Amino acid sequence: GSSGSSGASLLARYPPEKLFQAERNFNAAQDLDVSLLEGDLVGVIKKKDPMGSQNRWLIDNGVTKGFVYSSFLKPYNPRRSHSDASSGPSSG
């Protein structure tokens, strides 16, 4: 839920050294892949895969876990005023 927030949360959720944005509109190719948005941001999770390839890394689209090629991703840079966080209380 809430894509924007997530994307903004990704900054807090994940570190800057693992903050990568979508270069272009990624189209899920495999079952391990997941549709993304060139405007959507992701946070590198694993720089490997259950096969043996550094080309495909595991990222989180603030929704699920998908596999994409760093090529499609880009090394973000929240440096210079570019960070935001948020929280959520509990209820009954």
C-alpha span between 72 and 84 (Å, rounded): 24
Q: How many residues does the chain have?
A: 92
Count of CB atoms situated within 10 Å of the CB of 80 = 6
Q: Which residues contact 64 (CB under 8 A, 6 or more apart)?
A: 34
**Within the chain, where are the H helices?**
3-13
The one-character DSSP state at 50 is T
Instruction: Tell me the two tokens of residue 86.
Output: 């948020």
Technique used by the depositors: NMR
- The answer to whether 54 and 2 have CB atoms below 8 angstroms apart is no
C-alpha span between 5 and 63 (Å, rounded): 12
What is the set of domains in the chain, with CATH numbers? Answer: 1-92 (2.30.30.40)
Q: Which residues contact 49 (CB under 8 A, 6 or more apart)?
A: 56, 57, 58, 67
